Write a structure and sequence with these properties.
This is part of a larger assembly, with chains A (68 residues) and B (79 residues).
Chain A: H1 2-9, H2 18-67
Chain B: H1 6-22, H2 27-44, H3 53-78
Helix pairs in contact in B: 1-2
The chains are: A mainly alpha (68), B mainly alpha (79).
GO molecular function, one term (chain B): transcription coactivator activity
Organism (chain A): Schizosaccharomyces pombe (strain 972 / ATCC 24843) (Fission yeast)
Subunit structure (chain A): Component of the Mediator complex.
Chain lengths: 68, 79
């Protein structure tokens, strides 16, 4: 009985992989372009981070010296 | 009724005067003796609690220099 009910649980699927394969290709292209966007915005990010880091460093040494 | 302020000093001196003017036994003197008793117990409860009053002034001033520099630097970054 368990095997029977599991056979009913079984959803019918096309043995042909064309639909799946096409889905696959869409996802790969999609993650590719999203990865490019991430890369551009990530280089700009790290540049920004360097800038703010310099301003930080000025602050820290200046503050320490002046108050102490 | 305990605090070691100037006012209770002036209380003492007024008690002394009133005794002098009152002058075998004395009801004004016994009031005076209660008063000096109170001040004695107030000084016995007293604790030395001493750091230099001159140093106290100096640290008030250099601390105030600290604070002024703090606000200067803070308002400097906010600008």
């Amino acid at each position: 009985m368990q095997i029977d009910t599991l056979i009913n649980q079984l959803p019918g699927i096309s043995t042909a992989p064309k639909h799946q394969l096409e889905k696959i290709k869409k996802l790969q292209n999609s993650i590719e372009e999203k990865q490019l966007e991430r890369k551009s915005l990530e280089s700009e990010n790290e540049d920004l981070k360097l800038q703010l880091a310099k301003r930080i460093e000025t602050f820290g040494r200046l503050s320490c010296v002046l108050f102490q | 009724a305990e605090l070691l302020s100037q006012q209770d000093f002036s209380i003492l001196q007024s008690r002394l005067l009133e005794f002098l003017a009152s002058q075998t036994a004395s009801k004004e003197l016994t009031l005076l003796r209660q008063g000096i008793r109170q001040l004695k117990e107030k000084v016995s409860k007293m604790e030395p609690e001493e750091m230099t009053v001159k140093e106290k002034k100096s640290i008030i001033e250099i601390l105030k220099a600290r604070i002024a520099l703090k606000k200067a630097f803070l308002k400097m970054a906010l600008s």
